[PDB]
Every structure is written in C-alpha cells, then in structure tokens.
Amino acid sequence: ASYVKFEVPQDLADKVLEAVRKAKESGKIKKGTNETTKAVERGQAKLVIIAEDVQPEEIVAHLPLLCDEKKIPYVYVSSKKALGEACGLQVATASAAILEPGEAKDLVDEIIKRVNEIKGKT
Amino acid sequence: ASYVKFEVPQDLADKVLEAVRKAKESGKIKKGTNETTKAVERGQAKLVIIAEDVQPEEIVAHLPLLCDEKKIPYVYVSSKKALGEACGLQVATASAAILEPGEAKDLVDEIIKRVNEIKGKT
Amino acid sequence: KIYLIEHVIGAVAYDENGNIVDYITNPRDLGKITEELLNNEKGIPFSATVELLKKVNPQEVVVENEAEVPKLQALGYRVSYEPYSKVSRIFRESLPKVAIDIKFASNEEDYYNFLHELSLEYTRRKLRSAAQKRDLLAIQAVRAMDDIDKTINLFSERLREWYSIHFPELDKLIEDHEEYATIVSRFGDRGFLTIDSLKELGFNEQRINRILDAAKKSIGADISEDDLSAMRMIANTILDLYNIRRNLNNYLEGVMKEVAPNVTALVGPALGARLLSIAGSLDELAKMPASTIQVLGAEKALFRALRSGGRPPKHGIIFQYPAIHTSPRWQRGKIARALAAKLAIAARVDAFSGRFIGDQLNEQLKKRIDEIKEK
Amino acid sequence: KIYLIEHVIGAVAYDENGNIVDYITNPRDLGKITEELLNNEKGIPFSATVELLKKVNPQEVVVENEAEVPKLQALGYRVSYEPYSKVSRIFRESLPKVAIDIKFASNEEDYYNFLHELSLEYTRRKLRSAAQKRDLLAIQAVRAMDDIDKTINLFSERLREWYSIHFPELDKLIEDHEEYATIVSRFGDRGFLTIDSLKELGFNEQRINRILDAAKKSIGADISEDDLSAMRMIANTILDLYNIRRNLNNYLEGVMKEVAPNVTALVGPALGARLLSIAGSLDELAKMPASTIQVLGAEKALFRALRSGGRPPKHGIIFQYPAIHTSPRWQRGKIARALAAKLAIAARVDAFSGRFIGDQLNEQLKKRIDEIKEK
Amino acid sequence: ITVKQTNMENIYECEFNDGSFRLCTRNLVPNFNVYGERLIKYEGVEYREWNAFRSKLAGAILKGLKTNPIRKGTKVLYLGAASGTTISHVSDIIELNGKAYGVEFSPRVVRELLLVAQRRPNIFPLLADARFPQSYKSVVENVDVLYVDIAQPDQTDIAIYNAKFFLKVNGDMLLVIKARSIDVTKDPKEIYKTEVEKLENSNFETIQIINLDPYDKDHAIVLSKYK
Amino acid sequence: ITVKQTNMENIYECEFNDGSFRLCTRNLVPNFNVYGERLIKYEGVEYREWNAFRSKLAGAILKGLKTNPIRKGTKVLYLGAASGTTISHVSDIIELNGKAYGVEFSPRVVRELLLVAQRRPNIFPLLADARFPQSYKSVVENVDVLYVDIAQPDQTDIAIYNAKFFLKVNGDMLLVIKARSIDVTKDPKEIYKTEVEKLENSNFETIQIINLDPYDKDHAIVLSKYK
RNA sequence: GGGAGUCUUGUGAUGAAACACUCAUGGUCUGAAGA
RNA sequence: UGUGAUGAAACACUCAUGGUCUGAAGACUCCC
RNA sequence: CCAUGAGUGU
RNA sequence: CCAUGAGUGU
C-alpha cells in the first residue's frame, strides 16, 4: 500500500495493539478516522495508529501529512478488524489515536522510539 | 400671503404676542421654525404661532399641514421681528410654539377658542 | 338651524333633534359618486347638496367638513362645521336602514353590493394618482443606481481576485476599476496586450511600458482560453454597468431638476434623490426639520445615541456633499448643520410649488462655508 | 562519522566536533541553486553533495532532512538524520563567515546581494506553482456565480418595485424573475403587449389572456418613453446575468469534474466548488473531518453553540443538497451527517489521486437516505 | 385531524395528524388563501389556518382574550388594514351579514389589499389617512368594533378620534399598542400604562389588557368599551 | 514638527503641528512607503510613520516594552511576515548591516511581500511553512531575535521549534500570543498564562509580558531569552 | 415480563440553531451664542 | 446668527490567516 | 439600529 | 461569529 510510509515488523504491530488495549482501560483513546483526525488537528494525540488494509486507501491518506505538521508520531497495524476489536469495538476501525496512555506510558514510549529508529533519527 | 389660512384681527394678534411673553417667564416655549416643527411632530405644543411676513413664504408653509394632522391649533402675527422680540430674542423669528402656558393658560384658552370661531366650528 | 349630511347615499338635512327635514338621493352611478367624493376632499359640495340647500331655505347651516364652509359661503349661506356631531352619528347609526328609506337602493342586499364596488372603484382611483407622482421615479432610479454602484464594486473586487491568478501584478498597477476591467475585456491573455490598443484608453507612454514589462516578467499562471473567457464575462458586465450607471445619472438629473430644482441646486441630482428615497417623498422631506435631514441615513448611529445618551452622528447621507468629506473633522459638524438648514428651506420651496431660488441658497451656503474654513 | 550540511553555500562535511572535514562549493548561479533547493524538498540531494560523499568515503553519515535518507541509501551509503543537531547549528553560527572561507563569494557584501536575489527568485518560483493549481479557478468561478445569483435577485427585486409604478398587476402574475424581465425588456409600455409577441416566447394560451386583461384594466401610471427605457436597462442587465450564469455553470462543471470528480459526483459542481471555496483548496477539504464538512458555512451558528454550549447547526452550506432542504426537519441532521461522511471520503480520493469511485459512494449514500426515510 | 368550535363564534381549533393545535376560520371563499396559509377540509367544509405569528388578533386569542366582540354579522372599522392578513380573518368570522371597513394609507400595500377585497364582499377597502376620518366619513356607517392596528406615535389619539366618529355607544375597541413605534427609548411597559390612561381619561372602560409576547415583541392589545 | 531619538536605536518620536506624538522609523528607501503611511522630512532626513494599530511591535513599544532586542545590525528571523507591514519597520531599524528573514506561507500575501522585499536588501522573503524549518534551513543563518506573529493554534510550539533551529543561545524571542486563534472559547487571560508556561517549561526566561490592548484586542506579546 | 437469534453501523449510529436579500410603516440630534 | 450659533459615532463592500458539532448506537424477528 | 406587515435568491 | 494583516465603493 502507498499511504504506508515505513515498515512495521509484527512484534511492534502486536506491541501497538497491546498499547491501545491498556489505553482503553486506563487512559483515553479516540477510535475512527474522523475522531483521529480531530485529535491530530487539536494536538491532543500522542500516538496515531493506522491500519494497512483500508479499502479505499485514500480514506486515511491525509493522516501522515497531518501528523507531520503537528509532529505527532504515527504507526501501522496490518488489520483494521484487529485494531477495532482491540479498541473495544466489535466492528473494524481504519485508524485510532491515544490521547492519554495511562498504564501504557512505558509501552508507548518504547513504540514512539522504535518507529524513530526504523525511520532514521538518533 | 398664501400660506395664511384665515384672518387675524390686530386685537387678537396682540393678545397672542402677550401670551407668548408670559409663557417665556412662567412656562416653556420653543422659538424658531425647526424647533417649532419638532414640537408639532412630537405633539408637545398647545399653540403654534406663525409670522405673516416670512421671506421665502414656503419656509413655514408646512406648519399648517403638520398642525392639522396632529390637531394642534395655530395662529398668525403680522411681524416676525415682533414675534422674535417677544420671544426674548433681539433677532426675528418666523414661527414659535407654546409647550406649557403657565401663567397664560386663561389667555391661551381664549385664543384657541377665538381662532375656532373665526374658522367655523361651534 | 339645519345640520347637513353628505354621504354616498346622497345629501340629507337634519334638525337639531335628528329628524330628516328633507333629503336628495344621489344617482346610483359609480362614475359620478366617485368624482364628487374626490371633489368633496377639496371642499366642493355634492350637486345633491346644492339642490337640497335650495329646497330648504335655512338661515344657519352646519356641515361635517371644515373645507366645505368657505365654498357654501360663496354660494350665499351663513355656515359653520361640527366635527363628530351628535347628528352625524345619529345619521350613521341608521345607515344600514336609511338607504332604503330615501330610496337609494330597494333593499340592503344591493346597497352593500353597490357600496362595495364604489369602495373598490374609489380606491382604485386614488391608487392611480399616487402612482402618477413624478418623484417616485426619481426615488426608484437612484435606488437602482445605488444597486449598480454596489454591484460594480462587488464584481470588480471579484474580477481582480480572479484575473490575478493569471496576471497578479496588474492589480496594483491599475487603481481604477473601469480601466482594469477594460484590460481583461479587450486583451484576454496577458501576452495579447499591445501598445496602440493601450494608447487608445488614454494610457501615457510610460505606463504602457510598465504594464507590458509586468506581463513579460509575470509570475502568473498559464491558463486556457476557456478559463480566460470565463473571467472576461465578468469584465464585460462591469463595463456594461458603468454605461448603465452614466445613463441613469443623466436620466436622474432630468427628473430631479423637474421635480425638485432647489434641492438639486444644493446637493446635485443623486444626493437630492437619495434624500427623497430615505424620506419617502418630496412632501415628506419638506415636512422635516433640518436636524432630521442632517442625519437621514446614519439611523444606526442615531438610535444608538438616543438610547444611551452618547454622541450623535454629525451627518447622515449628507456626508457625500463634497464640502463635508473633504473638510477636517471639526468643521464637518458645522457645514452639515448649515447644509441641512438650507436643504429644509430648499425642500419646502420645492414641495409647496415655489419657483427656483437655488442660486441665492448656494451663495448663502458657500458664504457660511467660507467663514467656517477661516479658523 | 560525518555530519553533512546542505546550504545555498554548497555541501559541507563536518566531524562530530564541528570542524570542516571537506567541502564542495556551489556554483554562483541563481538558476541551478533554485532548482536544487526545489528538488531538495522532495529529498533529492544536491549534486555538490553527491561529489562530496565520493571525495570523503564515510561509513556512517547523518543529514539534516529525513526525506534525503532513502535517496542516499539508494546511492550506496548507510544514512540517518538529526533534526536540530549541534553541528547544523555550529555551521549557521559561522555562516556569515564560512561563505568567504569556502570561496562562495569574495566578501560578505555580495554574499548577501546574491542570497537576496536567490530568495527573491526562489519565492517567485513558489508563488508560480501555487498560482498554477487548477482548483483555484473552480473556487473563483463559483464565487462569481454566487455574486451573480445575489445580483440577479437584487435587480429583479428593484425592477419589480420600479416597473410596478407603470404596471403593478404584472408582479403577482409572473413568479419567475427571468420571465418578468423578458416582458419589460421586450415591451416597456403595457399597451405594446400582443397575443402574437407573447406567444413568441411560449406563454400559454390562458396566461397571455390574464396578462393582457390586467394590462387593459391596469391602475398603473401613464409614463414617458424616457422613464420606461430607464427601467428596461435593468431588465436587460438581468437577462444578461442569467445567460452569464448559465455559462459559468457549464464552465464550473468542466473544471470541477476535472479537479474533484468524486465530490462533484456527490453534490454537483456548484456546491462542490462552494465547499472548496470555504475550505480554501481541495487538499484542505481533504484534510477535514466529516464533522467539519457538515458545518462549513454556518460559522456564526457553530461558534455560538461552542461558546455557550447550546445547540449546534445540523448543516452549513450542505443545506443546499436537495435531499436535505426538501426533507422534514427530523431527517435533516441524519442526512447531513451521512453526506458529510461521504464527502470527506470523496474529497480524499479526489485529493490523494485520481480514481473515480463516485458511483458506489452515491449508492451507499442513497441507501443511507432510504433507511432514514423509513421511520 | 379534527376541527371543532371554540368559545367564540366562527373560530375553530384543529387536532392534527401529529397532535398540534392551530386556530382557523371558516373560509368565506373556498379554494382561495390570502397569504400562504394552509387550507383544511373536514367533513366537507373548508377552514383557513390562522397563524398567530402574523395576526395580532389570533395572538390575542391564544393569550386568553376573555370575550371576542367580533362575531357573526358584526360591523367593524379596521384602522391599518395593511396587506389584508388579519382583516381577511375577521372577514371569515363576520360572514356575508357583517361588514369590515379597511382603512389604510400606504398605496404600496393597499395594492395587495385590493386583491383580498375583490374576492370578499365583506370588505370595503379605503386608501385614506386614519387621522382624517372626514375623508372616509362619506362611505362608512357606525360600527360595533373599532379594531386599531396603526403604526403611529399618536396612534391612541387617532383611535379615540375615529371612535367618537364611528364607534357605537357600548361598542368595543381592540387597540394594538405598538411600544417601539410610539417611542423606542421608553420602556414598553411604561407606554402600555400611559396609553391606557388616555382611553380611561376619555371614557373607555378597560376590559382586558393582553401582552402579545411570544407572538409579537413589545406589543400589547387593549379591549375596552366606549360609553 | 520635531523629530527626536528615543531610548531605542533607530526609533523616533514626533512632535506635530497640532501637538500629537507618533512613532516613526528612519526610511531605508526614501520617497517610498509600504502601506499608506505618512512620510516625514525633518532636517533633511526622512522618517516613516509607525502606526501602532497595524504593527504589533509599535504597539508593544507604546505599552512600555522595557528594552527592544531589535536594533542596528541585528539578525532577525521573522515568522509570519505577511504583507510586510511590521517587517518593513524592522528593516528600517536594522539597517543595511543587519538581516531579516521573512517566512510566510500564504501565497496571496507573499505577493505583496515581494514588492516590499525588492526595494529592501535587508529582507529575504520566504514562501514556506514555519512548521517545517527544514524547508528554509538552507537559506537562513542563525539569528539574534525570533519575532513570531503567526495565526496558529500551536503557534508557541512552532516558535520553540524554530528557536532550537535558528535562535542563538542568549538571543531574544518576541512572541505574539493570539488568544482568539489558539481558542475562541477559552479566556484570553488563561491562554497567556498557559503559553508562557510552554516557554518556561522549554528554557525561555520570561523577561516581560505586555497586553497589546487598545491596539490589538485579545493579544499579548512575550519577550524572553533562550538559554 | 424472562430467554434467543438477525440486519445496518467508527469507511460514523444517536442527538442537534444552514446562509443571503427586498419592500412598506412608525420610533429621527442639540437650541444661543460666535470672531 | 432662530430663514439656526455651539457641541456631536456617515453608510456600503472585498481578500488572506487561525479558532470548525457530538462519538455507539439504531432497526427487526423467533421461543414460553 | 428597534418593532410591525408583505415578499425574494442559493 | 471572534481575532489579526491587506484593500475597495458612495
């Protein structure tokens, strides 16, 4: 897919889905592309999670561009059904956002730092 | 003149000028065409005095029409210099109004009834 | 003593008691009754009334309307009027009925059928003479002129924003909207401008060169002919509207000198008409004190001051008078007050028939202005 | 480890300490630098940088920009990037000076002369590709269309008030502004009206008769040819605008299908353009959430709700979509919400490239509407 | 839908498809509406929906007007007939028996009053200034109701003047008090008190004073009896 | 008329024909004005009137800005240069020695900035997004003053980011806080407090905090030093 | 009233103040000083 | 200079930038 | 500007 | 609608 900027290994993808679940429980998340958008536009989001199997690709294509302007890190997962079902929904979701990590702070900080390494940085 | 609706005998004209002077002293008058106009428009005036020697006639021509709409009685005097100099001015005046007669109530009520008789009425 | 009544029903004479002494019934004719009612407004008695005042020979008669009195004195009788008299009421209390009694109609059914159609025809007639006043066209025209003014400005602002996609530097180079529009209209692409076609507008040698160099080095967009003609539609509309405006100014000047020559003498056709349009008519303008005429327009400003006791406006639509908006802020109040003062006089000579005296009015005004400025 | 710098000045390699290990000076040519800076934005390295990474043979290199990394990896090196690195700062701290040291200019005097003219030319170039975006014309066009709409209505309102001095009955007889205008445009006086000339525009048998009878029995004013043609100028302007409008719609449709086909599939050219206009651009519309799109227009209503915690607008400029304004009030919010959602997707497929998928989008939308309507 | 009589002659209420209640009158000219109002058939009889937001009389009704002196075969002088919105409804109420004389001095508006009064034998339009009843003295009769809705600072005085011309003794006057066109500066509530005093200081016997809020801002209507 | 120096370099006050006092700067391009401003000759030297209602810097001065870090030969990065109003005045202040780098991302407006920057060798226009200092990294040098007037909700964060790229250690930042374009809902005074905290929680040393009222509603300017 | 399933739904359910104009009528500064 | 001195907030538009709703439910059907 | 009555455009 | 910067018309 073309709106996917970099490569996420499955270990990281699983650590992301975990991070989201703990954040439902102990913090505050936003679920769905529109709500994720508003979370970036408002600067509330600490981490943005985008699914790789969105079916018209362009639905989430604006997020990489938007997150870079607001300097909010974003990450990919492979299944939208899996992200939504993480999110506490019984339906799929195309993108989500973590606003407050709560009991996942340590878990998120490792993610936002692994995606830095496999992006360039130091 | 053509804006003069009826004929005022000089005995009356003098009783008018008198009524005004007592009204400067004990009541409230308005002096000048624009201030007389506002007094009619606002329905404050009990008697409107117009001069017969105004020198473009049309300057006060609207007062008869205005006074009849608001049903305020009007009267003429022959000299504008005489009416202004009655008014407590040292210059002429083309028209004036009595808003509160004060110590001219009896004097005014006789005037507004004499102009009724020499107008038609009963 | 005979109390006399005038109605659609005819002319009736009553004593002080309220008994019909004698009557003359009107003809049941729409045409003639309408005319006599219109005539009665000016004081003119019904012809049924003339005949009635002959049959009875009354020494002291009393009528309903004060305008009739001098007409009936000229006809030979001693006359007065009582407004809302007991007799006029007594008559109307029995007005459903006495239409039948004096045989104006056979029954109630077609007294009203007639009266209805009289009222219909009587107002139809008044509606016409109201439309026939010449000042109404002065008002409409200036209103349409103020619409066109507003549109020219809206379109020109649009056009500059639009055409600036192709040739942005031209915007700050042409101050005048009409000129700008002529360029977009006549040329199209920026690369179609030419010297002589530009000399033809009035552009001086030097400016032509600045425009052409601006077009050469332009950082504007290369664009299709479809796109340009789209913009050019607005340009041509702008130009049209400028011609229509000038045509309307001349039309307006003609009417304004005809309908209000004194006012026109003072503030020009447009501003005079504008003042008519806010007042509603010339006869309404005339009835105004100067302190109103001075603030017409500016109502938001006025009622703000009247509600709160703050500072009032110095000038309403009168601001447009050259002497005011060019003058410093502290002189404006006095020039306005003086203008309004003269305008009121101008309006009144205009309204109440008086022939042109605008020359001395202007002179009186310019004197007052010259004094104001010498401080 | 080598820290690499790119600047107008050229390509400089630093060690971790902040000492120039090696440099390659750029050519002092406005043309080539500008292009390489424009190219650097997309991640393309300077050609001076390519030569420098050869002269030095570094194992681990670190650049300023994250877009460059994958380009230099494709060229053979192991690469990373540091944003606001100490090295990059160290370079700019000495940047008035190190221009002279690497011999980019002889003195400071004409480093700044050059850099000034680079900046001038570098923004001149950006200004151009901004202007060259096709959506801007779509926006301007609809904005002018909206001006024309507004004006048609203003003039038609004026015309009816004006022309009714002469022929008042015609106003309530002709609903349609264009028709009304056509009559005043072709005739002026009401005694010029004919069964023949009126058939010659397609007015139906029965209506022609009602018009002519109304003109016969008219209580209007009798008025000069000068007065009528004044009015007819407005009528013709109104007629002109209607034609210009229809032309603008077709133009708008042309551009809108080209620039944002999916959006246009949903709401039509006009309303589509109208959303672009409010958003500012297509890419801006694309970045929006549905909940914004749903309320664009209606800003007064929105911020009133947001300041006070009151009830928000269900719909902004989207109200114009037929399914909304025709539907009952309790259906509208749902329809709006569904539309906006689809529009957001439409704008995004339109923005981030190409494909027409407006048919399924419409199909999904009409499914959602049919459900809403069955309650 | 259901339509049924109210306490007042020829005035009805509707139960609606949804459960709202709106006033209406019996349509004197069936199939034809004066403003945009809804026409409603029920048991083969047609009613015109009486919008309270437009007609101050309907407004007064919905604000609990004790007794309405406008009924079957009433004679009413109606000062300020305007476009014919309210007067059309009093036409309906009054029926062919009674009569309504509509005084209105704005030609731009009497234009549209004509159309209403053409279709309606009840209504006798008059393009005249209500300050000079002399200029319609010759067309009208005396009347039971003086319905006065005129925008004028001296509107109360005007009304009284017409009253002593045309209002039967023991007749009724419905006087609309427009605060903001008597004085925008004064408090609407001061105005209502002072204008009612004018009526009392003549000899009108205040029966009921209503405030037309929701329906009309800064307005009140007075019902009183002339003596 | 009389023109004289003030506490701050190249910034002057005028006594006027009438007795008014207005700020002005020394005209770098004599005979030429950027907006509509008044040009004034005194002792054969020309000055440009500095209207406080347009320029926030002139405002801040008239509200008593202790010490102005913009002077002769200063290097400034100007975020949000717009049409060139204020930046033209900092060009006058800075003189040919110093340099101003005007970043502005609205093409409609950089259009008019170009004209200002052509006439003035001081000013280096840049059509770029202040959110990405990488996109102008390659034209600018490090600076003494970071003057930041950008309408953005995260304006402060943008400013800090540019600071750690371009602002010299111990340099100064003039940051304009636009309450209504951060959040129209929140109280302007709560916003000023929370934004200053962002500067402090970075490492900027708040020197002075001015409220730009009369001249700019719901605006405050902060002066602070980067460490 | 207890139990059970099916359809649509984060690619957005539910709730919820779209915008722009015209006409008519009325409310429409101060009041004796100035060089 | 009361045929108006003195005081005293005329009206209509355009562009650019930012601030731009809510967030999980709703509808059906079958067994006693 | 406030109020009342009548209407128009997307 | 609020704020900022730039302008237009009578």
Ligand SMILES: Nc1ncnc2c1ncn2[C@@H]1O[C@H](CSCC[C@H](N)C(=O)O)[C@@H](O)[C@H]1O
């Ligand atoms: N002096 C006067 N004589 C007659 N009509 C007047 C008047 N002053 C104002 N009016 C009219 O009074 C009207 C106020 S509108 C009245 C509304 C109408 N009665 C209804 O409810 O449907 C306006 O049409 C106005 O022209």
Ligand SMILES: Nc1ncnc2c1ncn2[C@@H]1O[C@H](CSCC[C@H](N)C(=O)O)[C@@H](O)[C@H]1O
């Ligand atoms: N992200 C961003 N990058 C650069 N400029 C921006 C921006 N966001 C907003 N702006 C600009 O900030 C400007 C606000 S107006 C600034 C006024 C100017 N400094 C002066 O005093 O003269 C606008 O021109 C806007 O285009």
